Design a protein around this ligand. Structure first.
Ligand code: CLA
Ligand code: CLA
Ligand code: CLA
Ligand code: CLA
Ligand code: CLA
Ligand code: CLA
Ligand code: CLA
Ligand code: CLA
Ligand SMILES: CCCCCCCCCCCCCCCC(=O)OC[C@H](COP(=O)(O)OC[C@@H](O)CO)OC(=O)CCCCCCCCCCCCCCC
Ligand SMILES: CC1=C(/C=C/C(C)=C/C=C/C(C)=C/C=C/C=C(C)/C=C/C=C(C)/C=C/C2=C(C)CCCC2(C)C)C(C)(C)CCC1
Ligand code: SF4
Ligand code: SF4
Lengths: 31, 740, 80, 31, 34, 73
């Protein structure tokens, strides 16, 4: 039916990349 | 200072709970931050632009991910008319078993929400067919948002912070926006349509696996360079075409057919490809106008300051003084922000007005709740953007305007007669209001007294003429495109109006929203709309033009944009600031979009049932509105839960009551004012300091009542959240309960 | 604290000093008016911002103005 | 200045003439 | 069969993120260092 | 892949792209044996010239084999 478990796990691992970049940008905008 | 908020030493030394609220409400006002220069202002804004843009792309990634992982998109492909789209899944431990049963819908395994944003129709129209394609879209948007997040981090670094000269180079940014961001992006969307969306509509799979192999047209790029461009319009799709299948499928990639596709009841994909190609060429041509590093082009500043018209002296362009208007635009961020919010709000209204009339997504014209939610969504977004446009015009006039650099130009001339403008807006608003309310009350009384033939019913003969000028034969006027003998019909010297047969086929069928038939109820509600627009403009324009000073308060610019009042003296000065005209106008804007969305919904809800006579007979008096639209349509909403059980409309019933509650909570902040609550909180502070064991703990920052401006904020935010959520619950539940 | 500033159109009728509930204002010697006196605001840290002085002022728009600024315990008028 | 007001009434008469042109199409005088 | 992720992420978003976020923000707005 | 003048013109186009990059970003393009013209060549040495055309043959062979593998040429 839907996408697999591997694709959801890969998407979460990829979403860690804008999470880290967003943390750096939000801290830079404050700095 | 030495404590939060860091950008305000004045707030950081506040000993009360007001410190927290004003720190929140001044966090994005970068100009009022301490130690803020202009270069650091522009650099910080550029970085927040990138971060905001990343928030948008992560949001679109979310849409694709939840449809791919939890929706029914592949099942929705084979039947877009009878399958309900899925937004996402529900995981809520508060649901009882009847609720879990009630939301297990649309052929899903568990409880789900139905999507009403039309993302299935849009993704299906532009060529997506599987859940993996939605997945790769969402992961691509995750990396694309990563790209913008890194760019916003990188342009805060010392080597990569742009200069203040770079930000104020306006001609280069206009050339690049018109040429690239509009023109190349429209050209690339035409490339997508021709390469992917049209072959997928004709049954052919085109992906990243095989697009370099597949030619879109069998004569690929040979007739483009030879100039035989008419080859790409030959063999269009037939009227027997079925979308996503090969039967009835042509080979043309750039047509000029006009009208709607017969099955999907939406615009032709080849017309949309040809559209984006044409305006791509035209926006790229526009993006070569202005002067940059290469010598040729226009200096906009020389165009503003120009004082001779072919050797004849003038005041300026159109004999109008524009000296300093370039610097007024370019040096003020609030002038630019109000101007962009005005243009973007007009574009947002124009999008809403064209997506119901001329739908472009396959099978969305039969999804009624989607059409309703999308119209109402964009009209609400548009009234918010227009209110922000005039709000930033007022902030410009307070903070950034000087009359010395604008001496003698057109903006100073507008300021010189501002009482004439405000008084004439006042006259037009009163003149519309008295007579529109008077005709409504006349019709109400004469229909109440058993004599509905005594109504004042006025045909909208001018807008009916415009519909007859487009080829609508129903009125019988026999004018420009409804007259076959006319020069506008035949296009006499060239006969090249290729669009016209499909256009008249689309406008003369009564089975769509393309120039709906209008009557006296349409007349009365349009004058209600003109009242709403003129009165909202009156409040906004008055508060912009009196922002710097009035006769009641001549030094109003010395207090800023948002301040409570000027005290009890001179009669009393409640709501005197320019921020208060924002506040007063947001009510009129919500009221206005309430009138236009009531009218849209009730006319279309008469359309979708084959009973147009309900709107045509009952919209001329206000009890007909109050009875046949509000009372009658809310029944299946308010039975979303009842003593007998629950169904799938119970969230909309709970949200309907929720929105009433939040709206009514707003009245508390708008009616009760501060000193009542300050005297109350003082006795509470007494009781906490006198109560044993509770004496062990207390506040670090002193409880005070909310400020006057903060109260207007919190009240208006409640009013508008309740307004939106109530109408959303009613709109969605009434349409989705009557039409699935 | 709030900022209270006195402009030169003062006529020295002393009504702002009388209206003031927190003793911000006082009258000082001067020579620019017939009454030979202006109002002066040395104790603006006691100013709560209630603008009774602006209510009391008789000149056409206000020889005295209060500009609301940062909030303290005194300017907010807290007994706690 | 300009007691005949010749420039602003040129454009006003032009807009009024375009208005009479649309009205002439409305009453089927010009077809 | 990744539908079990909801019973992790929805309690995290609803309880863990508000407690950690409001604890950080409370101790930050009461701090006197910066 | 039968030889056609499309293969010839894509080899010439790759040679022109490579001599364009070789004029734009070679650190030392003027070696000791210079070209006799040095005005239609932009100012080169003969080794920089045949370096650019050899890299144009790298690019051209890669292009025409890739486009034959797709189905274009
Ligand atoms: C589109 C949304 C958006 C964006 C891009 C910004 C951007 C910014 N805000 Mg802001 N703000 C917003 C919405 C937004 N705001 C709203 C809705 C409010 C109302 C509550 C505020 C209230 C607010 C305050 C009160 C302050 C800012 C501050 C800031 C700046 C630094 C942010 C920071 O400290 O990150 C910190 C956040 C994180 C590290 C969280 C990231 C974690 C994820 C998971 C990664 C930055 C310019 C601060 C500022 O300018 O001080 C100099 C500041 O004090 N904002
Ligand atoms: C070709 C070069 C190029 C390109 C592509 C861009 C692109 C952009 N610049 Mg940029 N810029 C350039 C050169 C360029 N710039 C140059 C040379 C300079 C120096 C003078 C600047 C200086 C500059 C500044 C200082 C800023 C930007 C900003 C922006 C962004 C605008 C916000 C946005 O998302 O617009 C997107 C807009 C569109 C895609 C089109 C307009 C939208 C229309 C109205 C909608 C209608 C179209 C259609 C119906 C939509 C279909 C709907 C369907 C998809 C659902 C955008 C990404 C801002 C930004 O965000 O910074 C990050 C900003 O602050 N630019
Ligand atoms: C910016 C948008 C865009 C992009 C990136 C492409 C990209 C491409 N197109 Mg395309 N195309 C576009 C817009 C676009 N097109 C539009 C607007 C039209 C209609 C006029 C076409 C009509 C079209 C045809 C008919 C064909 C292509 C082909 C191609 C491919 C090879 C182009 C070539 O031979 O090099 C040309 C290099 C410089 C001019 C390439 C994938 C060909 C293809 O894919 O064949 C397999 C092909 O046959 N395109
Ligand atoms: C491109 C759009 C844009 C941009 C960049 C700005 C930017 C700005 N505006 Mg502005 N504005 C806009 C659109 C925009 N506005 C629109 C559309 C309106 C009309 C509504 C306004 C009306 C407006 C006013 C009236 C004022 C500003 C101000 C400001 C400045 C500071 C904002 C700030 O700190 O607020 C801080 C942000 C917050 C406190 C967050 C409030 C969040 C709201 C209430 C929504 C929250 C409701 C809730 C979450 C709903 C969900 C509940 C749930 C139960 C459903 C900043 C320059 C202020 C300023 O400094 O001017 C001098 C000011 O007084 N703007
Ligand atoms: C049949 C019932 C009816 C009723 C009860 C009203 C009631 C009203 N009308 Mg109305 N009106 C009607 C029919 C009716 N009208 C019709 C059929 C027309 C079409 C010609 C108008 C056109 C009309 C106009 C144009 C105006 C009103 C105005 C008014 C209000 C004040 C009237 C008045 O005498 O003030 C006492 C009079 C004065 C205080 C000053 C004199 C102003 C008068 C109305 C105009 C004189 C100017 C002169 C003749 C040039 C006219 C210019 C015009 C063509 C633009 C009042 C609510 C006024 C209004 O709404 O203003 C907000 C207004 O300006 N009405
Ligand atoms: C049903 C609610 C309602 C009504 C009718 C009005 C009516 C009006 N508002 Mg409004 N307003 C409202 C709610 C409402 N407001 C709310 C909730 C807010 C938010 C605070 C505002 C904020 C607001 C602002 C900020 C502004 C207005 C303006 C106006 C005027 C617009 C012009 C017009 O329509 O003239 C026609 C007038 C009417 C339709 C109303 C009165 C007509 C009656 C029926 C006359 C007959 C009386 C009759 C003799 C019976 C009396 C019996 C008595 C003798 C006992 C008008 C007086 C603008 C204004 O004053 O423009 C000059 C303006 O600037 N209003
Ligand atoms: C959005 C996130 C979220 C989530 C995931 C939950 C989850 C839950 N809520 Mg809660 N709730 C929330 C937000 C949320 N709530 C908010 C915002 C409100 C205010 C409106 C409420 C108000 C509310 C009430 C009033 C009650 C719940 C209850 C429950 C439980 C479900 C009923 C059941 O059969 O479990 C039964 C399961 C248990 C009794 C086991 C308890 C779980 C242990 C203690 C977790 C340990 C965590 C701890 C902090 C460390 C479940 C644990 C009911 C409940 O039983 O909770 C005690 C209940 O009485 N909630
Ligand atoms: C028009 C440009 C063009 C096009 C369409 C192609 C296309 C292709 N090249 Mg290619 N190539 C090009 C230019 C081009 N090349 C140039 C300029 C060079 C010189 C640097 C090369 C050098 C080159 C080599 C050395 C090889 C290819 C190979 C390939 C094929 C498979 C590559 C793959 O999928 O690996 C996917 C890899 C994933 C990790 C593919 C058809 C391969 C091939 O022919 O295999 C049969 C191969 O080994 N290319
Ligand atoms: C969710 C929001 C969580 C924000 C708290 C951040 C925890 C970071 C914790 C952390 O990273 O600390 C590090 C970061 C940098 O500050 P330091 O801890 O270095 O503090 C020393 C400073 O005083 C500099 O001298 O602290 C801040 O960002 C605190 C200021 C947040 C001020 C709030 C601004 C953000 C509000 C806007 C977001 C809300 C609106 C939502 C938009 C959609
Ligand atoms: C129909 C048609 C047509 C026409 C069109 C037109 C002509 C249109 C127009 C339109 C328009 C024409 C629109 C308008 C709009 C406007 C607006 C929307 C405005 C706004 C404004 C603002 C908001 C302002 C603000 C400010 C202030 C207040 C102060 C200072 C600053 C500023 C300036 C910013 C054509 C021919 C094509 C064809 C056929 C159809
Ligand atoms: S605002 Fe109040 S305390 Fe301050 S000077 Fe005026 S009357 Fe006195
Ligand atoms: S009331 Fe005004 S004019 Fe009179 S003494 Fe006070 S400041 Fe001066």
């Amino acid at each position: 039916s839907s996408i697999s478990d591997t694709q959801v796990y890969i998407a979460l691992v990829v979403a860690l990349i804008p999470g880290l970049l967003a943390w750096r940008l939000a801290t830079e905008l404050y700095k | 200072a030495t404590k939060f908020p860091k950008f305000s030493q004045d707030l950081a030394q506040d000993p009360t709970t007001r410190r927290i609220w004003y720190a929140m409400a001044m966090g994005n006002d970068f100009e009022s931050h301490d130690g803020m220069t202009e270069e650091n202002l522009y650099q910080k804004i550029f970085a927040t632009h990138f971060g905001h843009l990343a928030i948008i792309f992560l949001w679109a990634s979310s849409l694709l991910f939840h449809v791919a992982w939890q929706g029914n998109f592949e099942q929705w492909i084979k039947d877009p008319l009878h399958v309900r789209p899925i937004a996402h899944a529900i995981w809520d431990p508060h649901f009882g078993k009847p609720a879990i049963e009630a939301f297990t819908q649309a052929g899903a395994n568990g409880p789900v929400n139905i999507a009403y944003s039309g993302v299935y129709h849009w993704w299906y129209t532009i060529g997506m067919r599987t859940n993996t394609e939605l997945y790769t879209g969402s992961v691509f948007l995750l990396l694309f948002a990563s790209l913008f997040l890194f760019a916003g981090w990188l342009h805060l670094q010392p080597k990569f912070r742009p200069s203040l000269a770079w930000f104020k180079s306006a001609e280069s940014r206009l050339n690049h926006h018109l040429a690239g961001l509009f023109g190349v992006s429209s050209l690339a969307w035409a490339g997508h349509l021709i390469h992917v969306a049209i072959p997928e509509s004709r049954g052919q799979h085109v992906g990243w696996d095989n697009f370099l192999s597949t030619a879109p047209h069998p004569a690929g790029l040979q007739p483009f360079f030879t100039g035989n461009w008419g080859v790409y319009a030959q063999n269009p799709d037939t009227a027997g075409h079925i979308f996503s299948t090969s039967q009835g499928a042509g080979t043309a990639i750039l047509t000029f057919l006009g009208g709607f596709h017969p099955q999907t009841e939406s615009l032709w994909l080849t017309d949309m490809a040809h559209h984006h190609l044409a305006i791509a060429v035209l926006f790229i041509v526009a993006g070569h106008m202005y002067r940059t590093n290469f010598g040729i082009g226009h200096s906009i500043k020389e165009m503003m300051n120009a004082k001779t018209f072919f050797g004849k002296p003038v005041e300026g362009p159109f004999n109008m003084p524009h000296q300093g208007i370039y610097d007024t635009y370019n040096n003020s961020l609030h002038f630019q922000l109000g101007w962009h919010l005005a243009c973007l709000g007009v574009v947002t209204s124009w999008v809403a007005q064209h997506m119901y009339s001329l739908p472009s997504y396959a099978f969305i014209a039969k999804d009624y709740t989607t059409q309703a939610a999308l119209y109402t969504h964009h009209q609400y977004i548009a009234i918010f953007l227009m209110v922000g446009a005039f709000a930033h015009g007022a902030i410009f006039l307070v903070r950034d305007y000087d009359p010395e650099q604008n001496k003698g130009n057109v903006l100073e001339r507008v300021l010189q007669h501002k009482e004439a403008i405000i008084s004439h807006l006042s006259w037009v608003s009163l003149f519309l209001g008295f007579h529109t309310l008077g005709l409504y009350v006349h019709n109400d009384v004469v229909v109440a007294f058993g004599t509905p033939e005594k109504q004042i019913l006025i045909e909208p003969v001018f807008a009916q003429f415009i519909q007859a000028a487009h080829g609508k034969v129903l009125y019988g006027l026999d004018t420009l495109l409804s007259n076959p003998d006319s020069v506008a019909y035949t296009a006499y010297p060239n006969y090249a109006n290729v669009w016209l047969p499909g256009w008249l086929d689309a406008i003369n069928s009564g089975t769509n929203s393309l120039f709906l038939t209008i009557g006296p109820g349409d007349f009365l509600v349009h004058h209600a709309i003109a009242l709403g627009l003129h009165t909202t403009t009156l409040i906004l324009v008055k508060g912009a033009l009196d922002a710097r000073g009035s006769k009641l308060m001549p030094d109003k610019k010395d207090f800023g944009y948002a301040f409570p009042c000027d005290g009890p003296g001179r009669g009393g000065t409640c709501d005197i600031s320019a921020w208060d005209s924002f506040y007063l106008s947001l009510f009129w804007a919500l009221n206005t979009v309430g009138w236009v969305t009531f009218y849209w919904h009730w006319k279309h809800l008469g359309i979708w049932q084959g009973n147009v006579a309900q709107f045509n007979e009952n919209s001329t008096y206000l009890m007909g509105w109050f009875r046949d639209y509000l009372w009658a349509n809310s029944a299946q909403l308010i039975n979303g839960y009842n003593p007998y059980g629950v169904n799938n409309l119970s969230v909309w019933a709970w949200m309907f009551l929720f929105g009433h509650l939040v709206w009514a909570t707003g009245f508390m902040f708008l009616i009760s004012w501060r000193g009542y609550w300050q005297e109350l909180i003082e006795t509470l502070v007494w009781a906490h300091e006198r109560t044993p064991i509770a004496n062990l703990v207390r506040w670090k920052d002193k409880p005070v009542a909310l400020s006057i401006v903060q109260a207007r904020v919190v009240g208006l935010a409640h009013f508008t959240v309740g307004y939106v959520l109530t109408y959303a619950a009613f709109l969605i539940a009434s349409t989705a309960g009557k039409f699935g | 604290s709030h900022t209270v500033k006195i402009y030169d159109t003062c006529i020295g009728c002393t009504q702002c000093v009388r209206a003031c509930p927190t003793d911000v204002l006082e009258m000082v010697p001067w020579d620019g008016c017939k009454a030979a006196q202006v109002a002066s605001s040395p104790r603006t840290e006691d100013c709560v911002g209630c603008k009774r002085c602006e209510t009391a002022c008789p000149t056409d728009f206000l020889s005295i103005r209060v500009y609301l600024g940062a909030e303290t315990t005194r300017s907010m008028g807290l007994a706690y | 200045a300009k007691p005949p007001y010749t420039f602003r009434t040129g454009w006003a008469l032009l807009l009024l003439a375009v208005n009479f042109l649309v009205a002439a199409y409305y009453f089927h005088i010009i077809q | 069969d990744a539908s079990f992720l909801s019973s992790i992420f929805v309690p995290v978003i609803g309880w863990v993120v508000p407690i950690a976020t409001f604890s950080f923000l409370f101790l930050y707005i009461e701090r006197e260092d910066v | 892949l039968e030889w056609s003048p499309t293969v010839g013109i894509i080899m010439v186009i790759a040679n022109v792209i490579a001599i364009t990059f070789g004029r734009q970003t070679i650190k030392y393009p003027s070696a000791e044996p210079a070209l006799p013209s040095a005005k239609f060549f932009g100012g080169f040495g003969a080794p920089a010239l045949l370096a650019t055309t050899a890299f144009g043959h790298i690019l051209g062979v890669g292009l025409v084999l890739g486009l034959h593998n797709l189905g274009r040429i």
